[PDB]
Design an enzyme around this catalytic site. Structure first.
Site, PDB file in Angstrom:
ATOM      1  N   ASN A  13      46.467  42.165  49.727  1.00  0.00           N
ATOM      2  CA  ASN A  13      45.540  41.301  50.469  1.00  0.00           C
ATOM      3  C   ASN A  13      46.252  40.577  51.626  1.00  0.00           C
ATOM      4  OD1 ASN A  13      42.625  41.125  49.579  1.00  0.00           O
ATOM      5  ND2 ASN A  13      43.615  40.977  47.580  1.00  0.00           N
ATOM      6  N   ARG A  90      48.566  30.743  40.200  1.00  0.00           N
ATOM      7  CA  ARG A  90      48.807  29.408  39.640  1.00  0.00           C
ATOM      8  C   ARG A  90      47.662  28.440  39.934  1.00  0.00           C
ATOM      9  NH1 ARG A  90      52.064  25.917  38.801  1.00  0.00           N
ATOM     10  NH2 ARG A  90      51.835  26.384  36.562  1.00  0.00           N
ATOM     11  N   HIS A 108      38.691  36.687  44.602  1.00  0.00           N
ATOM     12  CA  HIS A 108      38.578  36.871  43.163  1.00  0.00           C
ATOM     13  C   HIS A 108      37.905  38.215  42.895  1.00  0.00           C
ATOM     14  CE1 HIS A 108      38.259  35.681  38.949  1.00  0.00           C
ATOM     15  NE2 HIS A 108      37.025  36.163  38.986  1.00  0.00           N
ATOM     16  N   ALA A 140      37.590  24.914  44.798  1.00  0.00           N
ATOM     17  CA  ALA A 140      37.197  23.608  44.285  1.00  0.00           C
ATOM     18  C   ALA A 140      38.044  23.313  43.053  1.00  0.00           C
ATOM     19  CB  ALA A 140      35.718  23.579  43.954  1.00  0.00           C
ATOM     20  N   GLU A 141      37.921  22.113  42.494  1.00  0.00           N
ATOM     21  CA  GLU A 141      38.799  21.720  41.406  1.00  0.00           C
ATOM     22  C   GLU A 141      38.606  22.648  40.205  1.00  0.00           C
ATOM     23  OE1 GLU A 141      38.618  17.576  40.331  1.00  0.00           O
ATOM     24  OE2 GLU A 141      40.164  17.859  38.795  1.00  0.00           O
ATOM     25  N   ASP A 142      37.356  22.899  39.838  1.00  0.00           N
ATOM     26  CA  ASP A 142      37.076  23.843  38.761  1.00  0.00           C
ATOM     27  C   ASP A 142      37.300  25.280  39.218  1.00  0.00           C
ATOM     28  OD1 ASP A 142      36.606  22.332  36.530  1.00  0.00           O
ATOM     29  OD2 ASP A 142      34.469  22.053  36.960  1.00  0.00           O
ATOM     30  N   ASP A 144      37.449  29.063  40.167  1.00  0.00           N
ATOM     31  CA  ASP A 144      36.458  30.093  40.528  1.00  0.00           C
ATOM     32  C   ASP A 144      35.020  29.571  40.556  1.00  0.00           C
ATOM     33  OD1 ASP A 144      38.533  31.961  40.694  1.00  0.00           O
ATOM     34  OD2 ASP A 144      38.280  32.569  38.600  1.00  0.00           O
TER      35      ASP A 144
HETATM   36  N1  LIG Z   1      41.960  24.131  41.144  1.00  0.00           N
HETATM   37  C1  LIG Z   1      41.913  25.524  41.392  1.00  0.00           C
HETATM   38  N2  LIG Z   1      40.718  26.094  41.606  1.00  0.00           N
HETATM   39  C2  LIG Z   1      40.575  27.407  41.852  1.00  0.00           C
HETATM   40  O1  LIG Z   1      39.450  27.859  42.043  1.00  0.00           O
HETATM   41  C3  LIG Z   1      41.701  28.215  41.892  1.00  0.00           C
HETATM   42  C4  LIG Z   1      41.817  29.577  42.123  1.00  0.00           C
HETATM   43  C5  LIG Z   1      43.139  29.993  42.066  1.00  0.00           C
HETATM   44  C6  LIG Z   1      43.644  31.400  42.263  1.00  0.00           C
HETATM   45  C7  LIG Z   1      43.787  32.073  40.908  1.00  0.00           C
HETATM   46  C8  LIG Z   1      42.451  32.081  40.189  1.00  0.00           C
HETATM   47  C9  LIG Z   1      42.545  32.887  38.906  1.00  0.00           C
HETATM   48  C10 LIG Z   1      43.508  32.379  37.862  1.00  0.00           C
HETATM   49  C11 LIG Z   1      43.036  31.624  36.795  1.00  0.00           C
HETATM   50  C12 LIG Z   1      43.931  31.146  35.849  1.00  0.00           C
HETATM   51  C13 LIG Z   1      45.288  31.424  35.977  1.00  0.00           C
HETATM   52  C14 LIG Z   1      46.285  30.887  34.940  1.00  0.00           C
HETATM   53  O2  LIG Z   1      46.855  31.635  34.167  1.00  0.00           O
HETATM   54  N3  LIG Z   1      46.521  29.486  34.922  1.00  0.00           N
HETATM   55  C15 LIG Z   1      47.435  28.890  34.015  1.00  0.00           C
HETATM   56  C16 LIG Z   1      48.303  27.926  34.796  1.00  0.00           C
HETATM   57  C17 LIG Z   1      48.998  28.707  35.889  1.00  0.00           C
HETATM   58  C18 LIG Z   1      49.718  29.880  35.255  1.00  0.00           C
HETATM   59  O3  LIG Z   1      50.666  29.670  34.455  1.00  0.00           O
HETATM   60  O4  LIG Z   1      49.376  31.064  35.513  1.00  0.00           O
HETATM   61  C19 LIG Z   1      46.728  28.196  32.864  1.00  0.00           C
HETATM   62  O5  LIG Z   1      45.847  27.321  33.089  1.00  0.00           O
HETATM   63  O6  LIG Z   1      47.025  28.495  31.675  1.00  0.00           O
HETATM   64  C20 LIG Z   1      45.761  32.169  37.052  1.00  0.00           C
HETATM   65  C21 LIG Z   1      44.867  32.646  37.997  1.00  0.00           C
HETATM   66  S1  LIG Z   1      44.145  28.662  41.755  1.00  0.00           S
HETATM   67  C22 LIG Z   1      42.890  27.537  41.661  1.00  0.00           C
HETATM   68  N4  LIG Z   1      43.049  26.233  41.416  1.00  0.00           N
HETATM   69  N1  LIG Z   2      42.194  35.312  41.426  1.00  0.00           N
HETATM   70  C1  LIG Z   2      42.837  35.973  40.304  1.00  0.00           C
HETATM   71  C2  LIG Z   2      42.987  37.454  40.561  1.00  0.00           C
HETATM   72  O1  LIG Z   2      42.785  38.264  39.667  1.00  0.00           O
HETATM   73  N2  LIG Z   2      43.351  37.805  41.797  1.00  0.00           N
HETATM   74  C3  LIG Z   2      43.550  39.199  42.135  1.00  0.00           C
HETATM   75  O2  LIG Z   2      44.934  39.561  42.172  1.00  0.00           O
HETATM   76  C4  LIG Z   2      45.103  40.681  43.048  1.00  0.00           C
HETATM   77  C5  LIG Z   2      46.299  40.493  43.976  1.00  0.00           C
HETATM   78  O3  LIG Z   2      46.555  41.691  44.711  1.00  0.00           O
HETATM   79  P1  LIG Z   2      47.541  41.697  45.986  1.00  0.00           P
HETATM   80  O4  LIG Z   2      48.785  40.947  45.532  1.00  0.00           O
HETATM   81  O5  LIG Z   2      47.769  43.171  46.254  1.00  0.00           O
HETATM   82  O6  LIG Z   2      46.761  40.955  47.040  1.00  0.00           O
HETATM   83  C6  LIG Z   2      43.811  40.798  43.841  1.00  0.00           C
HETATM   84  O7  LIG Z   2      43.060  41.911  43.344  1.00  0.00           O
HETATM   85  C7  LIG Z   2      43.048  39.533  43.528  1.00  0.00           C
HETATM   86  O8  LIG Z   2      41.644  39.778  43.544  1.00  0.00           O
END
Ligand SMILES: Nc1nc(=O)c2cc(CCCCc3ccc(C(=O)N[C@@H](CCC(=O)O)C(=O)O)cc3)sc2[nH]1
Ligand SMILES: NCC(=O)N[C@@H]1O[C@H](COP(=O)([O-])[O-])[C@@H](O)[C@H]1O
Length: 200
Positions: A13, A90, A108, A140-142, A144
């Site tokens: 990406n 993260r 996502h 946002a905080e929550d 996805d």
């Molecule tokens: N506030 C906030 N809002 C979002 O909408 C968003 C999207 C993000 C982008 C990623 C969304 C998907 C995602 C889900 C969970 C995890 C996960 O495993 N989380 C762990 C802590 C971090 C870790 O150790 O990996 C946990 O809570 O146990 C990794 C990725 S980061 C983010 N932060």
């Molecule tokens: N938001 C959590 C999640 O599953 N994200 C996904 O990780 C991949 C990263 O690919 P890339 O490193 O080749 O961009 C992407 O498919 C993205 O949608």
């Protein structure tokens, strides 16, 4: 608009965003790539493109808040306007998210609100949908749950695995992430005062 891209791995990406932002009519420029993990392929992609990289390993900070602060300092250093999370795995803290409210995008690999979380493809396959897809949304905080900017549907084929389904869905991600970035960087789309998506 000045853009930071945050990554954790491969960076396909990231590469799509690099390619799009170098088009003459791009309203976005990528000025910094930040990874939470070292020696990941996404870093090679950035260096090969002549974009500065910083690694900020979350396993040297006492908590989530000061990890994000380390990110934010770099964002300030490069006078960043917009943050893209591109395979960044993260969760970000409340204050960090609130500061960048309306300025931070995430991709996502599902059609939100279905299959929130880190294993969307596994969920989609377990559930048995025949249509999945990907979503770009404001962060946002929550997790996805932020306002949706663009989505694209992608079929699930009989016999799909995480490997074959993620491959198909990544083709769509590489289309809508750059399109969404351009919409936000040009000021065409913003997070409205009422919190909903505003098309100007
Ligand atoms: N506030 C906030 N809002 C979002 O909408 C968003 C999207 C993000 C982008 C990623 C969304 C998907 C995602 C889900 C969970 C995890 C996960 O495993 N989380 C762990 C802590 C971090 C870790 O150790 O990996 C946990 O809570 O146990 C990794 C990725 S980061 C983010 N932060
Ligand atoms: N938001 C959590 C999640 O599953 N994200 C996904 O990780 C991949 C990263 O690919 P890339 O490193 O080749 O961009 C992407 O498919 C993205 O949608």
């Amino acid at each position: 608009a000045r853009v930071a891209v945050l990554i954790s791995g491969t960076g396909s990406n990231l590469q799509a965003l690099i390619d799009s932002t170098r088009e003459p009519n791009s309203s976005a420029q990528i000025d910094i790539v930040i990874s939470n993990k070292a020696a990941v392929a996404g870093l090679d992609k950035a260096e090969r493109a002549g974009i500065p990289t910083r690694v900020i390993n979350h396993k040297l900070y006492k908590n989530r808040v000061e990890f994000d602060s380390a990110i934010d300092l770099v964002l300030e250093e490069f006078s960043i306007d917009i943050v893209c999370l591109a395979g960044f795995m993260r969760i970000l803290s409340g204050p960090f998210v609130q500061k960048w409210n309306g300025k931070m995008l995430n991709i996502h690999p599902s059609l939100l609100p279905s299959f929130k979380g880190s294993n969307a493809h596994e969920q989609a396959l377990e559930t048995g949908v025949t249509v999945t897809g990907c979503t770009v949304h404001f962060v946002a905080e929550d997790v996805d749950a932020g306002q949706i900017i663009l989505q694209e549907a992608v079929p699930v084929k009989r016999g799909d695995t995480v490997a074959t389904l993620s491959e198909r869905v990544k083709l769509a991600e590489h289309k809508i992430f750059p399109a969404a970035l351009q919409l936000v960087a040009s000021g065409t789309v913003q997070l409205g005062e009422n919190g909903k998506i505003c098309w100007v």
